[PDB]
């Protein structure tokens, strides 16, 4: 006798995107500063999105080049749609966004806690795209904004601060209640926290969010991808 189930994963799918995009190829010179709206592929740089200046060609999603360009294009568009109070931490092969935790916690005067969303593009079955999103909570010494270990918190501020911060961090991850206890919806709440912070970071007030591009809309659905297996006993 076998079990059946549903798996939710931290991949949020792009359900609509422009299947053809404008590109402009220029010869690759090392002298050109890399940045948003341009991607080197071999001996060419391809401009795309807001990087399109006067002229252009087009590629569609059957082209090998399309995935290479679109992955980067998608993060560049996401980086134009960050909602306050989130801020850009890094845009490279990954997009990282941060928000300071402004909910009350003991010792928030000396220890700063910060959400960090880590966003990577996933590309599968030739034409499917999505974002894989991880969440971290950074623990910072408020007075100097540097990362601080629990060991250093104990050394600098005392054991009582180290213990209260650990409970608060665990509660902000949804591993514990505010009272420092385990609880029956913790694992569900942990995933719902990730989805809710991601929606907030992109200004999403419904399950689906549209982002404008010069090639047409990109639509993401801010629900975890779901995979269902039903066993036949
Ligand atoms: K919060
Ligand atoms: K504070
Ligand atoms: K889904």
Numbering used by the authors: 15 to 247
Quote the original article:
Here we focus on the prokaryotic Argonaute AfAgo from Archaeoglobus fulgidus DSM4304. Although phylogenetically classified as a long-B pAgo, AfAgo contains only MID and catalytically inactive PIWI domains, akin to short pAgos. We show that AfAgo forms a heterodimeric complex with a protein encoded upstream in the same operon, which is a structural equivalent of the N-L1-L2 domains of long pAgos. This complex, structurally equivalent to a long PAZ-less pAgo, outperforms standalone AfAgo in guide RNA-mediated target DNA binding.
To study the structure and function of the full-length upstream protein, the restored full-length open reading frame, with the missing TA nucleotides inserted, was cloned into an E. coli expression vector and the corrected protein was subsequently purified by liquid chromatography. We were able to solve its structure by X-ray crystallography in two symmetry groups: P1 (resolution 1.85 Å) and P3221 (resolution 1.4 Å). We henceforth refer to the full-length upstream protein as AfAgo-N. The upstream protein (AfAgo-N) is the structural equivalent of the N-L1-L2 domains of long pAgo proteins.
